[PDB]
Amino acid sequence: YKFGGSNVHFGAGCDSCGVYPIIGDRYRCKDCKEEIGYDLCKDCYETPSKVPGRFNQQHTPDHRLELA
Amino acid sequence: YKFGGSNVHFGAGCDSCGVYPIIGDRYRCKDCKEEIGYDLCKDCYETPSKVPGRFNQQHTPDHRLELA
Ligand SMILES: [Mg+2]
Ligand SMILES: [Mg+2]
Ligand SMILES: [Zn+2]
Numbered sequence: 246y247k248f249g250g251s252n253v254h255f256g257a258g259c260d261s262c263g264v265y266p267i268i269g270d271r272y273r274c275k276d277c278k279e280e281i282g283y284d285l286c287k288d289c290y291e292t293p294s295k296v297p298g299r300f301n302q303q304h305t306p307d308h309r310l311e312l313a
Numbered sequence: 314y315k316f317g318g319s320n321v322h323f324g325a326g327c328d329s330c331g332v333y334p335i336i337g338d339r340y341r342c343k344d345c346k347e348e349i350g351y352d353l354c355k356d357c358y359e360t361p362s363k364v365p366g367r368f369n370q371q372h373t374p375d376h377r378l379e380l381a
């Protein structure tokens with residue numbers, strides 16, 4: 246069981262706007278190799294901006310994201 | 314970013330043993346239709362017989378669990 250379902254992502258923060266926990270849809274990077282990973286909230290996902298990551302992930306526009 | 318990586322699943326509990334949060338690998342049911350979902354810790358996952366769920370998920374042995 247997981248409380249809140251996909252409406253909340255406990256422990257996940259948005260690397261663009263910094264919101265934590267992400268509320269609503271979460272998009273996680275499939276290609277970032279850093280253990281901390283890389284994530285965006287839906288709003289930041291819809292508006293592509295320059296964000297390599299708040300924790301030195303060096304995410305690029307060529308990486309693939311997926312709804313989590 | 315997601316603190317703890319895959320070593321911790323905040324907000325997720327094991328429907329068999331009750332550990333919360335699940336630490337270590339997490340196995341999520343692909344077929345339980347209920348929004349709360351169904352999850353197991355690795356130790357309860359390795360046991361072939363599967364509990365129906367602590368939140369009335371009525372999980373059945375037919376259902377398939379995936380590594381999350
Ligand atoms: Mg906050
Ligand atoms: Mg506990
Ligand atoms: Zn954001």
Ligand SMILES: [Zn+2]
Nearest residue numbers: 274277304308
């Ligand atoms: Zn990335």
Ligand SMILES: [Zn+2]
Nearest residue numbers: 327330354357
């Ligand atoms: Zn367990």
Ligand SMILES: [Zn+2]
Nearest residue numbers: 342345372376
């Ligand atoms: Zn199930």
